[PDB]
């Protein structure tokens, strides 16, 4: 067979240790999920420094905690806008998830509070910028570089899916690079705790599985399709299905013909055909062996999964950081004042925040 006695026993033991870990992780998640935290700071505790970008909803600002000098990334959501856009449930759910999860590649929520006009989520500042920026700057990542990032996403989805969470918005724009070169997943605006099948048309067009586009329901395997898209984009420099407008992108995905650059390795092409697989009876991540079909694939043969988790692998790219609050790894955005009305808005709708 493919493994002798020693290697087979080792792999079996490693897989049982993952199960033990995930059982403890679910216990801890559920305690926080059922009893969230709230109201752990206020706006005038922070200096507003610079806009870093926009999330799924609202903008993200670099801020500095006045009493400690620590820097954070603060997401600001306009309650009236959120109501108008039918995003009340999404914003409450995002904060609920963030305060309940705990994993080394998920951004951590440090404070949250609200006022008359806005909701605020104060998260760790990840100063190395978006993977999107670095990818567009150097064109494409060599396969070991892509693999290092991909392994972190595999472990992160393994964790999230054990909690019945589907992420639904994987893309380089949503992946920040920390000072050690590791990835942080930042935005949970479209994530959902789902027992099994769900139907919502949501996510980012290029990353949507065919079953999201089509009327049929779908499950957590859409995230494994999205991983395929991310690995392809990292290694090629462009995603597998593209066009000028969403409806045209959807047609390409459903038509489903994937072609690969000639520099892709055979191992990479095999992995991607098994992730970008329209047939759910065949898609990796969705079979009897679960995530192990991905982790044990030849393309990941050199990946030490525990060493990635323990952040002991040397990263392929270390961002340049010039002191606290340096924003040199971020684009510039239009700066809009943070207005706080004399009158409370939408109070009843956001009680739980």
């Amino acid at each position: 067979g493919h493994m002798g006695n020693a290697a087979a026993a080792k792999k079996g033991s490693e897989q049982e240790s993952v199960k033990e870990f995930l059982a403890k992780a679910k216990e801890e998640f559920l305690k926080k999920w059922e009893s969230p935290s709230q109201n752990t700071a206020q706006l005038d505790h922070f200096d507003r420094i610079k806009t870093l970008g926009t999330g799924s909803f609202g903008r993200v600002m670099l801020v500095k905690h006045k009493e400690t000098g620590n820097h954070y990334a603060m997401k600001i959501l306009d309650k009236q806008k959120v109501v108008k856009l039918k995003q009340i449930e999404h914003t409450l759910n995002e904060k609920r998830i963030l305060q309940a999860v705990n994993f080394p590649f998920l951004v951590k929520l440090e404070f949250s509070f609200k006022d008359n006009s806005n909701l605020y989520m104060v998260m760790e500042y990840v100063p190395g910028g978006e993977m999107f920026s670095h990818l567009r700057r150097i064109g494409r990542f060599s396969e070991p570089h892509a693999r290092f990032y991909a392994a972190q996403i595999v472990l992160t989805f393994e964790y999230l899916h054990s909690l019945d969470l589907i992420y639904r918005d994987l893309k380089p724009e949503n992946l920040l690079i920390d000072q050690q070169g590791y990835i942080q997943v930042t935005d949970f605006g479209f994530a959902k705790r789902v027992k099994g099948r769900t139907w919502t048309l949501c996510g980012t067009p290029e990353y949507l599985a065919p079953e999201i586009i089509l009327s049929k329901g779908y499950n957590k395997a859409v995230d494994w399709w999205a991983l395929g898209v991310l690995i392809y984009e990292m290694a090629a420099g462009y995603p597998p299905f593209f066009a000028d407008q969403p409806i045209q992108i959807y047609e390409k995905i459903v038509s489903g013909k994937v072609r690969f650059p000639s520099h892709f390795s055979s191992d990479l092409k095999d992995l991607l055909r098994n992730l970008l697989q329209v047939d759910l009876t065949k898609r990796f991540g969705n079979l009897k062996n679960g995530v192990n079909d991905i982790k044990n694939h030849k393309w990941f043969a050199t990946t030490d999964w525990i060493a990635i988790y323990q952040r002991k692998v040397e990263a392929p790219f270390i961002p340049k950081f010039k002191g606290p609050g340096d924003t040199s790894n971020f684009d510039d955005y239009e700066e809009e004042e943070i207005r706080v009305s004399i009158n409370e808005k939408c109070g009843k709708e956001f009680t739980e925040f």
């Binding site: 567009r136 893309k171 724009e173 996510g203 980012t204 462009y238 593209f242 000028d244």
Partner: peptide, 18 residues
């Protein structure tokens, strides 16, 4: 080339969710 086609008509900047 596929890359030329991406620059010509793919979305090359940041992509919003739907």
């Amino acid at each position: 080339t596929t890359y030329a086609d991406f620059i010509a008509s793919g979305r090359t900047g940041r992509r919003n969710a739907i």
